[PDB]
């Protein structure tokens, strides 16, 4: 009941001091599927109020942990003190194939480990020496990135100069990234800062090179970090459809694939939030058009395959229908087995910048209803694409606070919650089935047809697990 939700919101806000109350009220809203300009209902991408326990991360997380970290054959230096690189070492499951420590380096933590003397004198000389050491001990790395942590900009270091000098000296691509954590208000600005760094130091390397033989079916997967193998289970379908995937940005990605992307015919954007920046740039500079797609669940996947195929000739469209017919009996069997076990169950989600709206279709393919959703750092163009996907009178929350999330959950009483690691254990203690929707709870892939089977199996094992019937001691 729209009234009941509006009332819930106001009740929850009562605990806040005046300033925080007025601000938070603008980030909470009752959905109206008719709205197309989300700003009329909710504001986003603003700073978080102090002391409220936001679930958000920083720009470094958005640049190092999200965009750059996954590029497998490059060495990424967490530049600054030891903290940042250690907490983010192998925490995100951006899968890849490689010989780690030899030609690939994703799971390792390279850092300049700033000590007090580095703060006093600056770390540019340390950076230069570090680079020579990286070159000596990891000769097969194909490029280096410098991910700035908070102190870099604060002490006035000039990492751009160091990168230029060492880059020319070693004939190596060295990318300075100003993703210090104090910039922006969340992981989002980190994405933008990272996209601009790729554009300015990597993307135009082959602008004058014509040795790449292109075909009219060349595409690039933009914005899929291959969580649990998500990109590979996406790539397989596109190629079965007759297309040729030249690059993957950036799950299991190589620096060469990135440098080859300007030669593709179409950029396929999955994560709009993190890579719409570089996508717009490629259209502007190379004339490459880009389109958004969704590989979550059979309905969205079939719709996406068909929309993508329509961009090419009839032969691709024919293969598209052959691929859809091949998998039809597989996902129908998944639905046949699991939908009756999940039919009608209600889910509340809270994620980053894409999935909060992107997974709705998959839940509906299993007869489930998303009664609440929100993003940690989405912008309003994200909410514009969200309201039409959510049901009337469902709850929306931007940069939700720990307190808010807990209170909304106690009132709404979802049958399942899909959020992050910092949220997981809170709700399990409340007896509410919980599934991690960032790390897929160490399961996955969830993208495509093969991913749908796993997703269904996972929602079922958790929601209907026998443990949820045992939280109350029988002598109570």
């Amino acid at each position: 009941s729209r009234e009941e939700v509006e009332s819930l919101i106001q009740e929850v806000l009562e605990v806040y001091p005046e300033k925080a109350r007025k601000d938070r009220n603008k980030h909470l809203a009752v959905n109206d599927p008719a709205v197309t300009q989300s700003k009329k209902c909710i504001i986003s991408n603003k700073k978080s109020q102090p002391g409220l326990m936001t679930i958000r991360g920083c720009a470094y997380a958005g640049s190092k942990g999200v965009v750059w970290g996954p590029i497998k054959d490059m060495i990424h230096i967490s530049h600054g003190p030891v903290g940042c690189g250690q907490y983010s070492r192998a925490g995100r499951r951006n899968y890849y194939i490689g010989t780690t420590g030899v030609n690939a380096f994703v799971t390792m933590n390279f850092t300049s480990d700033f000590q007090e003397k580095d703060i006093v004198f600056g770390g540019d000389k340390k950076l230069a020496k570090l680079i020579d050491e990286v070159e000596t001990l990891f000769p097969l790395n194909k490029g280096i990135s410098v991910q700035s942590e908070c102190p870099i900009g604060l002490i006035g270091d000039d990492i751009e100069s160091v990168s230029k000098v060492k880059g020319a000296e070693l004939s190596k691509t060295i990318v300075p990234v100003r993703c210090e954590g104090f910039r922006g208000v969340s992981q989002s600005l980190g994405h933008h800062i990272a996209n601009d760094a790729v554009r300015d130091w990597v993307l135009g390397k082959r602008d004058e090179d014509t040795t790449f033989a292109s075909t009219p079916y060349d595409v690039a997967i933009i914005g899929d970090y291959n969580i649990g193998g998500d990109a590979w289970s996406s790539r397989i379908l596109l190629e079965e459809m007759g297309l040729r995937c030249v690059a993957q940005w950036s799950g299991d990605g190589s620096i060469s694939e990135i440098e080859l992307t300007p030669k593709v015919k179409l950029n396929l954007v999955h994560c709009y939030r993190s890579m719409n920046y570089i996508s717009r740039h490629m259209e502007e500079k190379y004339g490459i058009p880009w389109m958004e797609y969704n590989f979550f669940g059979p309905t969205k996947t079939i719709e996406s395959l068909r929309a993508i195929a329509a961009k090419f000739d009839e032969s691709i469209q024919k293969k598209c229908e052959e691929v859809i017919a091949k998998y039809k009996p597989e996902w129908e069997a998944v639905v046949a087995k699991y939908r009756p076990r999940l039919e009608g169950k209600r889910v509340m989600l809270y994620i980053g910048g894409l999935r909060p709206r992107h997974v709705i279709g998959a839940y509906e393919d299993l007869g489930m209803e998303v009664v609440g959703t929100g993003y940690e750092f989405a912008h309003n163009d994200d909410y514009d694409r969200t309201m039409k996907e959510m049901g009337d009178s469902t709850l929306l929350y931007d940069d939700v606070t720990g307190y808010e999330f807990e209170e909304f959950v106690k009132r709404i009483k979802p049958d399942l919650i899909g959020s992050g690691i910092k949220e997981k254990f809170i709700f399990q203690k409340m007896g509410i089935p919980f599934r991690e929707m960032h790390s897929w709870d160490y399961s996955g892939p969830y993208h495509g047809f093969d991913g749908f089977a796993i997703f269904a199996r996972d929602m079922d094992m958790t929601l209907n697990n026998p443990c949820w019937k045992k939280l109350q001691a029988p002598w109570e």
């Binding site: 007090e116 003397k117 006093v120 004198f121 600056g122």
Partner: protein, 286 residues
């Protein structure tokens, strides 16, 4: 046992000379002392070492991969009366925070075991011109509990003394750092001793000692030494011994009451150092 003291004061008024003669006097009477220079000029130990310039920790640290690459042995040097000497040094001109450079050096001495269980005293010779958060770090980080301010009967030196007292007041409500007194380095101004005693009284402290001007100090320094070592019979030598004894027996450690600019000027006028201002001409010509 071990008492941690810091000598704070404006530059250019003999503070380093007074600090080294105070220390030499304590070593002379049997105390174990360590001198840690915390002035970017790094001239707090030459008289004890009979040297032209002691290698600083900051200088050597900049050349190394990590500060732990340094060895106490190149940093700590034994001089007159066995007193141990160290110079923090500062970062290159224009780049670092001199204050953070000083904390880096002290943290190094701590880890390296430089503070022997033997030590009776440790004296930090710190710059007190501009009392910024940087130079106030030894206070904020409880590196020293007893602060002794060296000043003179002039405006700026006294102004510096009031600022240092302010620094102390800043951290007093959360730490044990306190003002043990003023040390007046005489510039031979007329009623100088009276003026500093008056300031001490207003600050709520004491003028622990009046160090008179004596040219024996310069004859000692041209030989790179303290008076205590150069001429122990000198009357000035006894001046430093009295200062030493009084610090050793000091029990007056307070949280000062900085005065206002007005209060300071009224004081400077009460002793002729400054004159009343005819505000009738303020803004005239011919």
């Amino acid at each position: 046992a071990m008492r941690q003291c810091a000598i704070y004061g404006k530059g250019g008024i003999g503070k380093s000379t007074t600090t080294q003669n105070l220390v030499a006097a304590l070593a002379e009477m049997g105390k174990k002392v360590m001198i840690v220079g915390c002035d970017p000029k790094a001239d707090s130990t030459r008289l004890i070492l009979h040297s032209k310039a002691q290698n600083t920790i900051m200088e050597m640290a900049a050349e190394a991969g990590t500060v732990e690459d340094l060895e106490l042995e190149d940093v700590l040097k034994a001089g007159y009366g066995g007193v141990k000497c160290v110079e923090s040094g500062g970062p290159e001109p224009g780049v670092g925070c001199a204050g953070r450079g000083v904390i880096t050096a002290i943290n190094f001495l701590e880890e390296e075991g430089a503070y022997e269980d033997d030590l009776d005293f440790v004296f930090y010779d710190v710059l007190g011109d501009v009392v910024c958060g940087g130079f106030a770090m030894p206070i904020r980080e409880n590196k020293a509990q007893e602060i002794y301010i060296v000043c003179s009967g002039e405006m700026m030196a006294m102004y510096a003394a009031n600022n240092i007292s302010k620094g102390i007041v800043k951290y007093a409500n959360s730490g044990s750092v306190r003002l043990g007194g003023l040390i007046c380095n005489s510039r031979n101004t007329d009623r100088e001793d009276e003026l500093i005693i008056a300031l001490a009284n207003k600050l709520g402290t004491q003028m622990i000692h009046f160090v008179p001007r004596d040219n024996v100090v310069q004859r000692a320094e041209i030989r790179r030494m303290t008076v205590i070592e150069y001429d122990p019979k000198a009357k000035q030598a006894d001046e430093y011994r009295a200062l030493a004894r009084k610090v050793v027996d000091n029990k007056l450690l307070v949280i000062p009451n900085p005065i206002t600019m007005d209060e300071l000027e009224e004081l400077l006028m009460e002793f002729g150092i400054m004159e009343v201002e005819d505000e009738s001409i303020v803004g005239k010509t011919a």
